Amino acid sequence: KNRAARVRVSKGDKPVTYEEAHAPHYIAHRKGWLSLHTGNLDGEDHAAERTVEDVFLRKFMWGTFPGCLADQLVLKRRGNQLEICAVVLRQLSPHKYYFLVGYSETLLSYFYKCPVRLHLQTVPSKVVYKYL
Amino acid sequence: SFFTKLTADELWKGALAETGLNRGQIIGEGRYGFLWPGLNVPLMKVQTIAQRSKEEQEKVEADMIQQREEWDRKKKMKVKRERGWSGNSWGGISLGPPDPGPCGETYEDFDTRILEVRNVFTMTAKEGRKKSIRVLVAVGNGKGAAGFSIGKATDRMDAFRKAKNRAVHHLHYIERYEDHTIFHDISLRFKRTHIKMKKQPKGYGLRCHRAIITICRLIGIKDMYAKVSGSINMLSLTQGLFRGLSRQETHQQLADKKGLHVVEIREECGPLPIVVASPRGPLRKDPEPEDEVPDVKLDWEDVKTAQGMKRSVWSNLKRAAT
Amino acid sequence: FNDKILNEPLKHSDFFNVKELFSVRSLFDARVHLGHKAGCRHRFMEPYIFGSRLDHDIIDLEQTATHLQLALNFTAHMAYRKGIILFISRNRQFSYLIENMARDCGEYAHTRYFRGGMLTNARLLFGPTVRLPDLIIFLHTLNNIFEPHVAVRDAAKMNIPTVGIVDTNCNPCLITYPVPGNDDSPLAVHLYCRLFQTAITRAKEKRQQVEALYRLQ
RNA sequence: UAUACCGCCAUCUUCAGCAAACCCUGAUGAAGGCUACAAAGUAAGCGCAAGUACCCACGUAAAGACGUUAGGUCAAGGUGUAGC
Ligand SMILES: [Mg+2]
Ligand SMILES: [Mg+2]
Ligand SMILES: [Mg+2]
Ligand SMILES: [Mg+2]
Ligand SMILES: [Mg+2]
Ligand SMILES: [Mg+2]
Ligand SMILES: [Zn+2]
């Protein structure tokens, strides 16, 4: 029984989010594109490095924000940067949020020489979409 | 390496294996001994840049480990669980009262009391032996308001609350005379469970099944002798007891039907007779047909108790308290 | 704040002129005393049935008239307190007439297929705060199949003063105010429907008159 | 150590049911609940269904649900006990 991204039903009480409540084949029907880069063209280079950077930054932002993420991230690319659209969960105080954001921005700028400025979207309750 | 890094919930699920979080690691205070204007100092009011020695950071880590150990110890805190009838079992155990209704009906006055628990294993087409559970709960505070119910399911708390709701929707009433003893004796034969009850006064003691003891405590009866004859089937015994309690001849109704008063010569008091019930209109002036040597099919146990002929290694021995 | 509603109507027998709504001769004209055969007759229906005419049961119209008076007085007193009445029927012989009568009356009805327990589980099936039927009047206790209707069971489980014209098959002991008599002829059904309609209308008129009398203060 | 898992995939799957919350029945037993000229069944939730892409909505693509096979993998990462 294949079980890629589709979640197996068990009881109608699974508080699943919006993005998490979508099969892995609806990328061209219902589900959109999270990360984007020219590496997945026919055909342009710069693909392996972009995918590695995306997979690394995802875990980085998820670790720096322990539990303060309502759902998965939505990476982007505009210039020599990598915008990250996230649905932050109202957990810590705004002062701590600003401090951590500034610290992470400065650290990334001085580490990768690329100002990876992110974006937040504070939401208290998780965006439950279905009860699988 | 970095490629060997992933989430933590997945690793936890894998380590647990049941098929077939950063509390101690603070996020605000830097894990390296350092001071900053942000936190650990007056919240922006001496805002400077300092650094703590590595020994101080090691001490902070040891304090966090001690806090983790204290939390683990708190997790080991024991609790009190009243033993129902049998040790470590849900025999005569009690729980919270039933929940109210939608519009109201404050049923919190009644008290719940789980009786028996049974794990039924029934095979299926593919799921196999279904671990189904059947429970029989009896709810009721007293004053006649009570009633049994049933609630079978593959769960515990769900089945308990289902049985509680069923009992709330199935409230039985029993006509009583002075909350202490039943009207008269009953000699029923429910299917295969015999019930031989005997009218006894107050302060006599509860000489009946523990389930029957709990049923009486919930109903209101204080003490009453009962010979649990025949097989010991919880469900059938309770059903027969309920049927007998529902089929009883009261005093007022009997007097209104027959007419004659209730004559009695209590031994505790004097010969002064005190009527217990009187008719609601007429009065049969003629007396009952005092036909001696009647045909009252008494039980052999009655004769054995009256003549003291009963003897065994467990006749009438001292029982527990409460 | 009007406690007189609990004393004025319940004082004099036949407050709304119940016995005058019908007549012994008018009831006999419908041949309601007729019944089914002794074999089809029910055991508990023996006391209410008088004799038989060549295996054709006959019901004493006196007991039927008394039960009808009692049921009509009960329904009138209920309407005086504003209550819902539910008509039941499944023989499909006079469903249109019963529907027209329910339309004429100021109450509801349901003479169609009764799903599995619509009144018991009314909390989930119907709305949560639904004014359950406070009275039931059976127009055809026997449905298409020789089986007692479940309405009596739901009533006994919900404690509702049941009314109806029991036949020689059902169990009148389960019904509160049974009414022995025929339940197949057309004239009898028409007379019963007209009597129920007149009773309801007169009860509503008397309720309005008593309300006006109270308002006179 | 995969006959301890997360994760991944394979047949049944040439399928149509699978269920929370309720009600009824079996003198209230494990259990069953189907008869539209209608006898107790109501069913949010998942799936078939449905919906969506190139050349349309067709043909080609995605899914084939609960579960048997302790199905195979330390052999992509960590992983209950042992050890160099
Ligand atoms: Mg013990
Ligand atoms: Mg394996
Ligand atoms: Mg296939
Ligand atoms: Mg497909
Ligand atoms: Mg699909
Ligand atoms: Mg293997
Ligand atoms: Zn009949």
Side-chain angles (χ1 to χ4, degrees), chain C residues 90 92 113 115-116 120-121 125 143-145 150 153:
Chain C
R90 188 52 166 170
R92 297 173 59 188
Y113 178 83
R115 298 177 85 186
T120 51
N121 195 359
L125 277 160
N143 58 324
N144 309 128
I145 292 157
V150 193
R153 221 160 49 73

Side-chain angles (χ1 to χ4, degrees), chain B residues 8-266 269-279 281-303:
Chain B
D9 185 78
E10 280 188 354
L11 304 177
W12 267 90
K13 287 165 73 185
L16 286 163
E18 297 174 355
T19 180
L21 192 135
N22 297 315
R23 188 260 295 164
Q25 297 151 323
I26 192 165
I27 174 156
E29 200 277 318
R31 195 173 173 287
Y32 266 123
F34 280 104
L35 278 168
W36 311 112
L39 55 138
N40 316 124
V41 306
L43 276 80
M44 295 154 275
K45 57 178 198 289
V46 180
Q47 44 165 350
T48 187
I49 292 156
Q51 50 266 19
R52 290 178 175 176
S53 298
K54 202 152 177 63
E55 294 179 355
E56 295 188 356
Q57 190 57 60
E58 200 70 32
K59 184 255 179 66
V60 165
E61 288 173 1
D63 181 73
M64 294 304 286
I65 291 155
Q66 288 288 315
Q67 180 58 41
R68 274 181 173 172
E69 288 176 354
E70 186 64 32
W71 179 67
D72 294 329
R73 190 190 301 165
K74 192 201 281 283
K75 191 191 278 184
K76 292 266 190 73
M77 195 73 203
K78 64 106 181 176
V79 289
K80 187 172 181 179
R81 167 165 160 181
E82 64 192 0
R83 302 177 288 93
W85 298 336
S86 279
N88 199 346
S89 66
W90 310 86
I93 192 160
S94 315
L95 294 171
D99 61 342
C103 190
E105 302 87 31
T106 55
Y107 284 117
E108 291 182 355
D109 183 65
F110 303 154
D111 176 76
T112 62
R113 263 194 199 279
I114 289 159
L115 305 172
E116 56 163 5
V117 178
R118 201 174 283 169
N119 294 294
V120 164
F121 300 95
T122 303
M123 292 294 289
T124 53
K126 75 282 285 189
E127 203 273 318
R129 55 200 312 165
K130 265 187 83 72
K131 202 248 283 174
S132 61
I133 295 157
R134 62 202 301 285
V135 186
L136 208 161
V137 190
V139 186
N141 57 334
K143 291 92 175 174
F148 80 102
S149 73
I150 42 157
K152 70 197 291 297
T154 192
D155 296 329
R156 197 177 74 179
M157 303 302 293
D158 298 330
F160 291 179
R161 61 187 192 76
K162 278 176 177 283
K164 280 160 60 160
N165 296 320
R166 189 76 175 286
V168 163
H169 277 111
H170 276 262
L171 291 164
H172 285 268
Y173 193 91
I174 303 159
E175 275 169 337
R176 203 174 50 266
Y177 148 75
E178 302 293 328
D179 195 3
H180 67 78
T181 321
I182 302 158
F183 270 98
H184 65 301
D185 303 339
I186 288 158
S187 60
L188 268 162
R189 181 181 82 268
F190 181 87
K191 288 183 178 173
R192 292 285 112 184
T193 40
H194 285 274
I195 291 157
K196 262 78 170 177
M197 290 202 286
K198 279 186 183 175
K199 190 169 185 168
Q200 305 298 119
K202 300 179 185 179
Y204 163 79
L206 278 156
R207 299 290 194 74
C208 46
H209 204 276
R210 59 198 199 223
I212 297 166
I213 286 169
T214 49
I215 289 154
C216 286
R217 195 178 291 168
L218 293 164
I219 291 157
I221 290 155
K222 293 201 85 73
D223 44 350
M224 67 99 204
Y225 182 85
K227 181 69 171 80
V228 185
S229 288
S231 68
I232 299 160
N233 197 173
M234 187 273 173
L235 200 149
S236 98
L237 177 134
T238 45
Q239 193 71 262
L241 186 69
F242 265 86
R243 186 183 285 166
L245 295 153
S246 292
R247 291 176 171 182
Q248 73 295 33
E249 297 175 353
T250 61
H251 290 318
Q252 180 56 253
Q253 299 176 357
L254 194 143
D256 298 322
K257 173 53 168 67
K258 296 190 175 179
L260 299 174
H261 292 81
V262 178
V263 183
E264 51 165 355
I265 301 162
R266 193 166 290 170
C269 317
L272 195 283
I274 293 155
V275 69
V276 178
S278 64
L283 183 277
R284 191 163 58 183
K285 290 187 180 180
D286 303 334
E288 251 184 344
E290 47 166 0
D291 290 328
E292 299 191 354
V293 287
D295 193 359
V296 183
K297 293 185 190 190
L298 57 103
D299 312 335
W300 188 241
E301 195 201 353
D302 307 341
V303 185

Side-chain angles (χ1 to χ4, degrees), chain C residues 36-203:
Chain C
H36 306 255
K37 198 166 279 188
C40 179
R41 185 182 63 216
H42 193 64
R43 183 167 168 174
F44 302 143
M45 268 290 291
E46 283 162 9
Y48 301 150
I49 287 158
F50 177 52
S52 74
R53 177 80 167 181
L54 282 94
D55 317 332
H56 303 85
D57 294 326
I58 291 98
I59 295 152
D60 264 315
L61 279 175
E62 299 295 326
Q63 301 176 7
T64 66
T66 310
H67 276 292
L68 275 160
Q69 287 174 355
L70 292 162
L72 289 166
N73 212 338
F74 193 94
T75 53
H77 289 315
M78 288 290 285
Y80 182 85
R81 301 156 179 285
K82 207 158 280 192
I84 294 164
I85 305 171
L86 202 288
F87 311 140
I88 290 152
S89 168
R90 188 52 166 170
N91 200 1
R92 297 173 59 188
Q93 191 175 358
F94 305 114
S95 61
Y96 192 56
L97 190 136
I98 298 161
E99 288 161 355
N100 302 331
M101 292 285 167
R103 174 182 275 90
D104 300 331
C105 295
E107 308 302 332
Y108 324 128
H110 164 62
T111 60
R112 273 59 150 280
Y113 178 83
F114 188 83
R115 298 177 85 186
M118 293 294 286
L119 301 162
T120 51
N121 195 359
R123 299 285 189 182
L124 289 167
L125 277 160
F126 291 110
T129 56
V130 172
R131 200 163 158 168
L132 305 170
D134 308 333
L135 200 134
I136 289 156
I137 287 164
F138 302 121
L139 275 293
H140 265 97
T141 171
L142 269 295
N143 58 324
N144 309 128
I145 292 157
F146 299 116
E147 173 169 359
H149 210 267
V150 193
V152 302
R153 221 160 49 73
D154 297 330
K157 283 177 189 290
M158 298 295 283
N159 307 318
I160 298 160
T162 46
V163 188
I165 308 168
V166 305
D167 212 342
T168 84
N169 284 120
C170 280
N171 285 308
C173 323
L174 303 170
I175 289 157
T176 64
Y177 290 0
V179 171
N182 187 7
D183 287 302
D184 294 300
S185 60
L187 200 152
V189 170
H190 290 56
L191 171 135
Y192 277 117
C193 275
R194 187 175 68 267
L195 286 168
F196 302 148
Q197 184 177 351
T198 48
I200 294 284
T201 51
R202 289 199 195 176

